[PDB]
Amino acid sequence: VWTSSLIKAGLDKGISINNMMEHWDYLQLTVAMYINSDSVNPVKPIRGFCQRLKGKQGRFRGNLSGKRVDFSGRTVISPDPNLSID
């Protein structure tokens, strides 16, 4: 929001075209590393709407297909022959 506000102020205010192209290329880069990240890096990756869909921790491979279900329990097992096999 702030860099778009700076463009909206500086373009009708009147500033240098090289600084305008630098700030607008930073606008172009910030969207490109805000969505579909880790293509540029000028824990320091940020997460956008591609690391939440990437794999093994995202919304495809551990939050949607394999999700943590309710009504379960986990305990070690001892043998017992005297129960039937059901």
Partner 1 sequence: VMTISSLEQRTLNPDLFLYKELVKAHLGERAASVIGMLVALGRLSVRELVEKIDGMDVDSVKTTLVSLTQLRCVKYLQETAISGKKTTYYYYNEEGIHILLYSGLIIDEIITQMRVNDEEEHKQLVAEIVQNVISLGSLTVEDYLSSVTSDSMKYTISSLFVQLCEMGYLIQISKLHYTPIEDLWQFLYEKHYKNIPRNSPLSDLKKRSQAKMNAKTDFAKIINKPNELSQILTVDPKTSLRIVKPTVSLTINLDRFMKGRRSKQLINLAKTRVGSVTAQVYKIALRLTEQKSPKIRDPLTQTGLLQDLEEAKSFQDEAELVEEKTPGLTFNAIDLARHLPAELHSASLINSHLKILASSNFPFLNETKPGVYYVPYSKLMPVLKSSVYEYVIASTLGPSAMRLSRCIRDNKLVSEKIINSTALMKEKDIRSTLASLIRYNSVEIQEVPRTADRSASRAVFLFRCKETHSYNFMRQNLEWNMANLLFKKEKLKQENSTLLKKANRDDVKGRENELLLPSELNQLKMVNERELNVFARLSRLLSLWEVFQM
Partner 2 sequence: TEGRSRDGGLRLGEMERDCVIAYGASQLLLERLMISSDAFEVDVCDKCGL
Partner DNA sequence: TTTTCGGCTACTATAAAAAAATGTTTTTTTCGTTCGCGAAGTAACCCTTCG
Partner DNA sequence: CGAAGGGTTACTTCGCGAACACATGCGAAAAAAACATTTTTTTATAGTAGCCGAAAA
User: Could you tell which of DNA, partner 1, partner 2, none binds residue 54, using a CB distance below 5 to 8 A set by kind?
Assistant: DNA
Complex with partner 1: residue 11 or 46, whichever CB lies closer: 11
Amino acid sitting at position 66: G
Amino acid sitting at position 71: F
**Interaction of residue 52 with partner 2, rule CB under 8 A:** no
Where does residue 72 fall: left (phi above 0), alpha (psi -120 to 50 degrees), or beta otherwise?
beta
Could you tell me if 38 and 45 are in contact, meaning their C-beta atoms sit under 8 angstroms apart?
yes
Using CB under 7 A, pick the residue from 5, 18, 65, 78 that binds DNA. 18
Using CB under 8 A, pick the residue from 3, 4, 9, 21 that binds partner 1. 21
Q: Residue 60 in 3-state DSSP?
A: coil
Per CB under 8 A, residues contacting partner 1 are 11-18, 20-22, 24-25
